[PDB]
Amino acid sequence: SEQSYRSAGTLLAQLASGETTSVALVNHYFSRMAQFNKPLNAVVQQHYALALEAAARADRERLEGRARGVLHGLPCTVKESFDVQGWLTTSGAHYLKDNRATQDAPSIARLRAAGAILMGKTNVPMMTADWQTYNDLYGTTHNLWDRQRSPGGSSGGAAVAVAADFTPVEFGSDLFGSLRIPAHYTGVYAHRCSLGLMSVRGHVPGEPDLSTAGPMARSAADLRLMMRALSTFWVEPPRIPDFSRYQAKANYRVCTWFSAPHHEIDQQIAQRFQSFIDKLRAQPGVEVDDAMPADIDPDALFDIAVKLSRNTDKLRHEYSRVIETLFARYDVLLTPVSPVLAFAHMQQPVRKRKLIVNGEPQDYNEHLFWNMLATVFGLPATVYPLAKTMDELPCGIQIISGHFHDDVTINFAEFCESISGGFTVPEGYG
């Protein structure tokens, strides 16, 4: 099979029905990386021989009725900073250029046990500590929509690989937007899981207290499929998210938070959000309120975020109660991921890095402002690609909900797919 941009869900169906095999899929993805990865520099380790062997095994198992696992026979790549047994985990640092993992990171092991075929790893900035993706070991990852621009970071290689169909899904860590920001800039879906829903151990730098992890994909159903594979609670659940299937709702009540004093977004995002909200407000049973609680001072929360990045705790626990009541009244909260769309590479020292909002220079740390909320309170957040004209860059929206409401945000993204937005194939790719 040579068809490009099939979803994981479709691919699993076609494996079951014999319209494709795992060997044909591994050859598809490595073929696309041969044809397209050089100018993008998204996949920085390739393990073809191991992947082809694993695919042959999956195919034998399928034929003999011995296939097991919800990802059985599905190839993928993972973020370079997660341990895969026998593979290098450099995190783009010279000090670790020959650091090879002894065992899988626990979430990697859980993809492998679901039957995923790991074909390689995708680029990260050094120690995954930036909102761009570049390092001295592997080079810069370029945004496939405009290669003079960054796909963001730290999961930038993963977002580009998904958007180029080098892989149907990806898996990465998210501290302050590490998964969400590259999804926004690059036009793919991402889900950062609730704190405690899945292990982030076996990550370099990397059970961490703020970092979570989750999938990238090109549909909401594929995000849900990954979470079926990945979820292993290590906190006591306040409730059990249901990842079994899309659960459609008759009523949605949505909160928006698109600006704060001194934290404005570019008018282009503002108009594209407004156009999306207009369509959402026109749906039966849907209310959309501009109802961010004023109880949460954004500057106070930013100061907490800056500190984390007996007194702060006091405020943090009080704000977490304001969020619980918020998500008893609203199903989801929609916010920006960044105040800008994808920018040209900025590898100067941090201090000199600017984001141009409505013509004015703004702080690079606006990335932290628009991602601290889910990070600080351990919340789930799905990033959903909005529509784009061929003359527009990708733009995502961040769908947040209460702790262990991961099913709610992913279900909300699938409902949005019926309204506006979704994955768009970049011009020049399959």
Residue numbers in the entry: 2 to 207, 215 to 317, 368 to 488
Give sentences copied directly from the paper behind this entry.
ClbL crystallized as a homodimer (space group C121) and a single polypeptide chain consists of 487 residues. Interpretable electron density for residues 318–367 and 208–214 is missing, suggesting flexible loop regions adjacent to and covering the active site. The overall structure displays a compact mixed α/β fold consisting of 12 α-helices and 12 β-strands. Compared with other members of the AS superfamily, a notable structural feature of ClbL is the presence of several disordered regions around the active site.
An amidase, ClbL, plays a key role in the pathway, catalyzing the final step in the formation of the pseudodimeric scaffold. ClbL couples α-aminoketone and β-ketothioester intermediates attached to separate carrier domains on the NRPS–PKS assembly. ClbL is a member of the diverse amidase superfamily (AS) of enzymes that are characterized by a highly conserved Ser–cis-Ser–Lys catalytic triad that is key to amide hydrolysis.
